[PDB]
Amino acid sequence: SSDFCCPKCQYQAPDMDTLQIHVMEFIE
Ligand SMILES: [Zn+2]
């Protein structure tokens, strides 16, 4: 995969930093 999918959503981010901004850390 040329993307990083959010394990909480069906949303996939083109970059891992973008995904990190999407999730904005976790409760885990
Ligand atoms: Zn998410």
Curated annotation (Swiss-Prot):
Changing M16V: In IP; impairs binding to ubiquitin. The leucine-zipper domain and the CCHC NOA-type zinc-fingers constitute the UBAN region and are essential for polyubiquitin binding and for the activation of IRF3. Changing V23S: Abolishes binding to polyubiquitin. Neddylated by TRIM40, resulting in stabilization of NFKBIA and down-regulation of NF-kappa-B activity. There is a cross-link at K8 (Glycyl lysine isopeptide (Lys-Gly) (interchain with G-Cter in ubiquitin)). Regulatory subunit of the IKK core complex which phosphorylates inhibitors of NF-kappa-B thus leading to the dissociation of the inhibitor/NF-kappa-B complex and ultimately the degradation of the inhibitor. Its binding to scaffolding polyubiquitin plays a key role in IKK activation by multiple signaling receptor pathways. Can recognize and bind both 'Lys-63'-linked and linear polyubiquitin upon cell stimulation, with a much higher affinity for linear polyubiquitin. Could be implicated in NF-kappa-B-mediated protection from cytokine toxicity. Essential for viral activation of IRF3. Homodimer; disulfide-linked. Component of the I-kappa-B-kinase (IKK) core complex consisting of CHUK, IKBKB and IKBKG; probably four alpha/CHUK-beta/IKBKB dimers are associated with four gamma/IKBKG subunits. The IKK core complex seems to associate with regulatory or adapter proteins to form a IKK-signalosome holo-complex. The IKK complex associates with TERF2IP/RAP1, leading to promote IKK-mediated phosphorylation of RELA/p65. Part of a complex composed of NCOA2, NCOA3, CHUK/IKKA, IKBKB, IKBKG and CREBBP. Interacts with COPS3, CYLD, NALP2, TRPC4AP and PIDD1. (Microbial infection) Interacts with Molluscum contagiosum virus protein MC005; this interaction inhibits NF-kappa-B activation. Residues 3-28 are annotated as: Interaction with CYLD. Heart, brain, placenta, lung, liver, skeletal muscle, kidney and pancreas. It is linked to Ectodermal dysplasia and immunodeficiency 1: A form of ectoderma dysplasia, a heterogeneous group of disorders due to abnormal development of two or more ectodermal structures. EDAID1 is an X-linked recessive disorder characterized by absence of sweat glands, sparse scalp hair, rare conical teeth and immunological abnormalities resulting in severe infectious diseases. Severely affected individuals may also show lymphedema, osteopetrosis, and, rarely, hematologic abnormalities. The phenotype is highly variable, and may be fatal in childhood. This is NF-kappa-B essential modulator. It comes from Homo sapiens. A zinc finger (CCHC NOA-type) spans 3-28. Zn(2+) binds at C6, C9, H22, F26. It is found in: Cytoplasm; Nucleus.
